[PDB]
Design a protein around this ligand. Sequence first.
Ligand SMILES: *[C@@H]1O[C@H](CO)[C@@H](O)[C@H](O)[C@H]1NC(C)=O
Ligand SMILES: [Ca+2]
Lengths: 82, 59
Amino acid sequence: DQRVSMPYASKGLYLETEAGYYKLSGEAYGFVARIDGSGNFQVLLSDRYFNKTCGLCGNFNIFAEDDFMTQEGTLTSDPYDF
Amino acid sequence: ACLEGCFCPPGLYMDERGDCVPKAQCPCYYDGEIFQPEDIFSDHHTMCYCEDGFMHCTM
Ligand SMILES: *[C@@H]1O[C@H](CO)[C@@H](O)[C@H](O)[C@H]1NC(C)=O
Ligand SMILES: [Ca+2]
């Protein structure tokens, strides 16, 4: 809840600005986030979590149809209740 | 038919406990079971929830 300044680098999380756009790197933990001026979240993530990370950006598999596996684990046809 | 008695305005629907309420906290009666207005609900194979009075089941 304490507002900090920027940039910021604690706990292996460099919180930087690149190309006038804000960045959050976690290369130890294998991810790089960022935002643009308008607001467009982006998440770069390694190959280490292939068929692991299940969430709102779906699994990191090859397929694209089966990447709605709910918090229970259920292939759903709706992109909404998921 | 068009009967006579004690009703309450259309925005309000009847609750079991004598008052009538909007459809926000109007429970569901799935399989007889009186579920509260927010009760996420599932066996292994189905998936079901009560939103505003209606019981939204899926599979
Ligand atoms: C992903 O992992 C699951 C659970 O272990 C396994 O059932 C499935 O075959 C794997 N799929 C791929 C593409 O490796
Ligand atoms: Ca996928």
